[PDB]
């Protein structure tokens, strides 16, 4: 569907521009950042619709992700499908759930419990899910249903979605990104 939601957490730490009707955004942080931002575009309510994107993503000098990002209302969850990233692979630190194959690559899957931390309903205890692409890329189709179905074997609600975006996150270093969601 048409974009109807803008994700903007600390976009002001760099240069965040977007056009919802065109499905485009860019985020430049070449001066560097020293706090976490999460910016992007998507939908007020997520779904299992496939997301197709194209991006220029330069983050070798940054702790950063290019990812589908969103939340589930109940059971409460934060999730990422990481297509590419900078100097930190987020499944290194976390509990492994094995792998899922989708859209031409194996993804490593991990989860963590998040205790007394900010959430879409305030301070809460919830679950976090990551799928991290083994063959990183900056364009393609994410068949989100394959990820959500696999995570649903491990507690993911796979329904009752809150917002869902294609996002760029970074919290250290410098980089740039331009993304189109077709």
């Amino acid at each position: 569907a048409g974009i109807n939601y803008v994700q903007n957490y600390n976009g002001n730490l760099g240069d965040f521009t977007y056009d919802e009707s065109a499905g485009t955004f860019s985020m430049y942080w070449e001066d560097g950042v020293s706090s976490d931002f999460v910016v992007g575009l998507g939908w007020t309510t997520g779904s299992s619709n496939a997301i197709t994107y194209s991006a220029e993503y330069s983050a070798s000098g940054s702790s950063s992700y290019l990812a589908v990002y969103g939340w589930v209302n109940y059971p409460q969850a934060e999730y990422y499908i990481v297509e590419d990233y900078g100097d930190y692979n987020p499944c290194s630190s976390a509990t492994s759930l094995g792998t899922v194959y989708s859209d031409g690559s194996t993804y490593q899957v991990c989860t963590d419990t998040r205790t007394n931390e900010p959430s879409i309903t305030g301070t809460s205890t919830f679950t976090q899910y990551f799928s991290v692409r083994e063959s990183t890329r900056t364009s393609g189709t994410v068949t989100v249903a394959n990820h959500f179905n696999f995570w649903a074997q491990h507690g993911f609600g796979n329904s009752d979605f809150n917002y869902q975006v294609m996002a760029v996150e970074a919290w250290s270093g410098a980089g740039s990104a331009s993304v189109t969601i077709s």
Partner: protein, 368 residues
């Protein structure tokens, strides 16, 4: 190797503890100069006369309600109670670490003051005393440094919940994914105090610098504390900072912020139904302290608001009592526990600097 202990935030008291030995825990007090606990046999009094250097050191910072073999005067940092105690040999039982994970069990000998059980009031259930982490010779970090032959330096990663991290002895800062760009600011030693102080040259609410009187923010003007979950502000800073915060908050088709009757010890509290949220916590004005060295210590809603009861959250800036506006003998700002939570903090008393890496929103000290 440095020594690692897991840190628990006690729900009832909001105080942070580490296991000490025998299932007993101690409260982390970053301004406390002594390690003290209740004792029984097998913490026998040390062979320390009250003229020796060790005894005078143990009595170097008398608590307000306490004048002057050795007898020290352990201080409960929550209630302010103090009592006479003897110095005794005790064991700090933990793990070593080569980074952040445990490697081997270790038993570290430390000198602690033996306090009467009455001094435990207001401490967490299961705590038998206080682990002082101030910059002085009988605090826990200094004692671990001499006994374990490691650095006079420690790391804190205080949790909001789940097990956080305390490491005594230095080494490279772990979790480079979060700490590789760690900013540092000088640690300032203040006369008559063992506490950790740093210098803020500005305070910003949103994107707007808070107008403070000339000289209000001085060298060593920010103290660090684990005694309270909230920030204490000297009156000359309290007034402009709170006015800026409440004005900005009031100006944010969602509900508009609605003040409610304050819940002690706080002065300004809101109906939580009238506050939004974002990935940093409640959607209230960001506050930044611009520190010497050029980096900022940031506060978001998780740091600047405290949930006190169903329906009410209070602003975590509280005005100091018994301190006149502009009194340079007192700190301008005392940062507390919830402003240190989910930061990796490197207290380096050899290089005399504090490293402060705020973790990004998707992680935190708990479970790190």
């Amino acid at each position: 190797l440095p020594v690692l202990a897991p840190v628990t935030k006690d729900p009832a008291t909001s105080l942070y503890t580490i296991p000490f030995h025998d299932g007993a825990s101690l409260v982390l007090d970053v301004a406390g100069p002594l390690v003290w606990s209740t004792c029984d046999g097998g913490q026998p009094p040390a062979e320390i006369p009250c003229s020796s250097p060790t005894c005078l050191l143990a009595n170097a910072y008398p608590a307000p309600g306490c004048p002057a073999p050795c007898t020290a005067y352990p201080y409960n940092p929550v209630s302010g109670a103090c009592a006479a105690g003897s110095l005794s040999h005790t064991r700090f039982v933990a793990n070593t670490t080569d980074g952040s994970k445990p490697v081997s069990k270790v038993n570290v000998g430390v000198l602690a003051a033996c306090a009467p059980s009455k001094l435990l009031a207001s401490l967490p259930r299961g705590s038998t005393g206080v682990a002082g982490l101030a910059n002085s010779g009988l605090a826990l970090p200094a004692q671990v440094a001499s006994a374990q032959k490691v650095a006079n330096r420690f790391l804190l990663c205080l949790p909001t919940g789940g097990p956080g991290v305390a490491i005594f002895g230095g080494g490279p800062v772990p979790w480079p994914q979060f700490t590789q760009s760690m900013p540092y600011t000088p640690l300032v030693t203040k006369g008559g105090s063992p506490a950790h102080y740093i210098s803020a040259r500005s305070i910003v609410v949103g994107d707007t610098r808070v107008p403070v009187p000339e000289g209000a923010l001085a060298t060593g003007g920010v103290m660090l504390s684990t005694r309270l979950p909230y920030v204490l502000l000297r009156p000359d800073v309290y007034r402009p900072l709170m006015d800026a915060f409440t004005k900005a908050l009031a100006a944010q088709g969602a509900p508009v912020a609605r003040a409610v009757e304050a819940v002690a010890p706080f002065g300004v509290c809101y109906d939580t139904k009238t506050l939004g949220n974002n990935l940093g916590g409640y959607a209230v004005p960001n506050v930044q302290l611009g520190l010497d060295g050029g980096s900022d210590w940031t506060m978001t809603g998780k740091n600047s608001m405290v949930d006190v009861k169903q329906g009410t959250a209070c602003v975590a800036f509280v005005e100091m009592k018994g301190v006149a506006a502009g009194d340079g003998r007192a700190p301008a700002v005392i940062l507390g526990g919830a402003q240190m939570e989910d930061f990796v903090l490197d207290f380096d008393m050899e290089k005399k600097r504090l490293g402060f890496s705020r973790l990004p929103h998707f992680t935190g000290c708990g479970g790190l």
